[PDB]
Design a protein around this ligand. Structure first.
Ligand SMILES: *[C@@H]1O[C@H](CO)[C@@H](O)[C@H](O)[C@H]1NC(C)=O
Ligand SMILES: *[C@@H]1O[C@H](CO)[C@@H](O)[C@H](O)[C@H]1NC(C)=O
Lengths: 33, 33
């Protein structure tokens, strides 16, 4: 257990899913335009 | 053995490490902003 910032080093792009959280604040850089 | 240019087709983003090289010149295209 070690909380780290979310980047493309540990995230991958996937398709839309209804279990996925819908974020409008503090978007991680992968999810930020 | 066949040296080819470094691109995103053969490189993946990883987290910071102390044994990684520190590049300031001729940065590969994945490492330019
Ligand atoms: C996120 O959005 C999808 C599509 O609107 C919705 O089905 C789902 O209930 C929402 N909530 C979360 C956080 O899963
Ligand atoms: C790269 O730079 C960092 C300082 O941010 C240093 O800790 C590390 O040893 C350097 N790596 C090499 C192999 O030069």
């Amino acid at each position: 257990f070690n909380p780290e910032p979310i980047t493309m080093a540990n995230a991958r792009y996937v398709s839309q899913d209804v279990k996925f959280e819908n974020l409008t604040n503090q978007l991680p850089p992968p999810l930020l335009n």
